[PDB]
Design a protein around this ligand. Structure first.
Ligand code: A1EFC
Ligand code: A1EFC
Length: 147
């Protein structure tokens, strides 16, 4: 019926159908369009107090809760989707990953290299697509597939 991981849902506030991907946590109004050895992705990471290493170049001691980190991620997603801010700009300023210095770019990678929820979301994204919040032991990610 639909590409890998998509399903139909109904908006609670408008009653309009929309589509949700349970691998990438992406959601959109339009019916999704239409696997490679490698993909290239950027990401924006927001760590929390239960992250494997609760520290980053932004903060020596990361104390925000998981729920607070999800609220920050959700806000970044809203501004990217509105065009008020670019993904690269938010990643450079606010990602808790060292890759912030490269606008979030991780380069290319194969299956078996990244943490599994990150890998699965990366490979389920189509080129140019953005994930919703993706949870790993490092924290919460927004993933952008660039190649
Ligand atoms: O630390 C700077 C830097 C630059 C470029 C790549 C990495 C890296 C990190 N972890 C796994 N693989 C590659 C790190
Ligand atoms: O897995 C690749 C990887 C992982 C984590 C960080 C990087 C990176 C890239 N560019 C600049 N700084 C850090 C790359």
């Amino acid at each position: 019926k639909l590409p890998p991981g998509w399903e139909k849902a109904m908006s609670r506030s408008s009653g309009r159908v929309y589509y949700f991907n349970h691998i990438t946590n992406a959601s959109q109004w339009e019916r999704p369009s239409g696997e490679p050895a490698r993909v290239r992705c950027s990401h924006l990471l927001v760590k929390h107090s239960q992250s494997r290493r609760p520290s980053s170049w932004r903060q020596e001691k990361i104390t925000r809760t998981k729920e607070e980190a999800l609220e920050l991620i959700n806000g970044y997603i809203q501004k990217i989707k509105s065009g008020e801010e670019d993904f690269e700009s938010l990643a450079s300023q606010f990602s808790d990953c060292s890759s912030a210095k490269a606008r979030g770019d991780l380069g290319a990678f194969s299956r078996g290299q990244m943490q599994k929820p990150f890998e699965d979301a990366s490979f389920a994204l189509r080129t140019g697509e953005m994930s919703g919040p993706v949870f790993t032991d490092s924290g919460i990610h927004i993933i952008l597939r660039t190649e």
